[PDB]
Symmetry: C2
Subunit: 346 residues, 2 copies
């Protein structure tokens, strides 16, 4: 693996990289795993660059999808909305290394942080991409996962019991009820991230005192044309889930951590002028009509966030070997789904 990494960096990267020896190669693990492993690759600090080649890069090893992912990543790189792309090959890619950390769950609620996520998401949403513009993604995905879910058979008792509790809700009928609520909820179709969680938002080192330009959104692998309401509602759902809990089930869920109407309004108040550059010049009461209906829009689409990820999580409980309480997480999402219906009175 060291040898393979060396060879990619040597052949894809220009300048000092082109004549680097194996023994001069510096690599270390950024992330392990069975898929999307990450490595930091660098020049000896004693090595001069010959030009504007990077001193350090990120290697991503994978471990239509591939074609679309790659075209998407390249376009974002060209537009300065994602890491630059230095090299692409069957088994992975080389990207810009961005010194940074990810946001913690508790930081999503900080006013400056949420204001900037809103601005960044709005920008993302206004971009033109060469992808199918028809919003079949949301329900096509849920239908895909539901089919799988109804075929699952566990052998171990605890998983058997957890599954039968979830199935007892009549998921097919419940998905038809959700389709109906969303049928009557107008929402623009935009280019959505679909996974805007803290773990996919970088706090960029050097600018943690910058007020409006300290973040970058990454990991656009679930991205697609989709209802705007899904992206924002999904993001609001993620204020409640903390994935860094060190004991089983490896997440904490807190329903009271969902943004208040006042926190929701602060977010959409940054989103709207960013998406519609003239918005601020509208009559104050058209502004209020817009905001109130959008609030209803995103809180209805938040239900699809629960439903989609709950179903996904049940499929993972069968096919993934990652250490995570997938069945416990699906139940957390379905608990939130029903609570949010009771909140909305639906």
């Amino acid at each position: 693996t060291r040898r393979r990494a060396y060879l990619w960096c040597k052949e894809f990267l220009p300048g000092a990289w082109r004549g680097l020896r194996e023994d001069e190669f510096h690599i270390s693990v950024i992330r392990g795993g069975l898929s999307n492993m990450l490595f930091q690759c660098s020049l000896p600090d004693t090595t001069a660059t010959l030009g504007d080649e990077p001193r350090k890069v990120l290697l991503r090893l994978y471990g239509e999808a591939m074609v679309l992912e790659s075209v998407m990543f390249a376009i974002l790189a060209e537009r300065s909305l994602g890491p630059k792309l230095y090299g692409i090959f069957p088994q992975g890619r080389l990207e810009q290394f961005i010194p940074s950390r990810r946001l913690d769950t508790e930081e999503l609620s900080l006013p400056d942080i949420s204001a900037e996520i809103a601005e960044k998401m709005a920008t993302f949403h206004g971009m033109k991409m060469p992808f199918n513009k028809e919003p079949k993604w949301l329900f096509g995905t849920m239908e895909k996962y539901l089919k799988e879910v109804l075929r699952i058979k566990f052998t171990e008792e605890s998983r058997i019991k957890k599954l039968h509790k979830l199935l007892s809700y009549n998921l097919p009928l419940e998905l038809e009820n959700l389709r109906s609520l969303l049928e009557s909820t107008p929402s623009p179709v935009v280019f959505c991230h679909n996974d805007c969680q803290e773990g996919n938002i970088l706090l960029l080192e050097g600018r943690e005192n910058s007020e409006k330009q300290k973040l970058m959104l990454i990991d656009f692998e679930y991205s697609s044309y989709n209802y705007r309401g899904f992206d924002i509602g999904n993001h609001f759902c993620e204020w409640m889930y903390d994935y860094s809990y060190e004991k089983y089930p490896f997440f904490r869920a807190n329903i009271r951590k969902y943004p208040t109407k006042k926190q929701q309004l602060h977010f959409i108040s940054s989103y709207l002028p960013a998406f519609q550059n003239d918005f601020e010049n509208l009559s104050t009461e058209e502004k209020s009509i817009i905001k109130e209906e959008m609030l209803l829009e995103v809180n209805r689409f938040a239900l699809a966030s629960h439903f989609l990820w709950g179903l996904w999580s049940i499929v993972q409980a069968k096919i993934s070997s990652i250490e995570f309480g997938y069945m416990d997480y699906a139940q957390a999402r379905f608990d939130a789904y029903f609570h949010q219906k009771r909140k909305l009175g639906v």
Copy 2:
């Protein structure tokens, strides 16, 4: 045909998204592996915003990530047709009102000067692809391997191949290896197929001296020796692929650029490619040029060899009505003629 309506309806914005099937228009441009079409809105329909009134559909036919990433990158940089949609069966691209150049137009001073400048621009780009120049001989070794094992059923083809194999193609490749390894040439991002048929003359730009053309169809592109891209383009001055009768090409060795015409090309290329060249002395400029002439005339030998070999393989597998074996023989004849000229 409803497939095409659906892709345009689904991938294209504005007035395209609410389009009914009975208002959709599609015309052919090239039948057959890369079938070309021309889809458009009704002349009565008004645009809601940006959307193109007309687009080009490309079908991958019989056969992806690299070519698609390349095409997307060139679109973003304004160096290729825009990319409007991408799917497993093809892509929708911007439609550029233009025509291709004719072979004879390659030698016109203003045309030649611009191609040189465009190629220099292509040559300076950074692309996320392998920078080792393994393409040239890797490709030639690959086609040679296929050539040594193919069997024709037709007697004419069997005899044409026999004459070609009689040159001792493996030994001649090693002869070309020693020549080229002794010939320095910088590695750059090469088009690799810069012929008249891949150069657009843009509509309404005919009077522009310096900006009337666009380079297209970068499917063979890779990091490769700069000498190849230039020597290859010089060879293309000799081949006219629009001839109306079998073998569907004309070859003319006398149409290879004179020294004068070659210097005219490189004198436009060089200032456009290396930033410091314009400010060099007359005498350092002439030194670079003379060495560049030796460089590219030598690499032109690889253009005849590679495409001769390629053309033998195509004779086996291609459906296209084209005299592939005769073209292969035309390329090997020019190969040997150019060696005699150069004294190598």
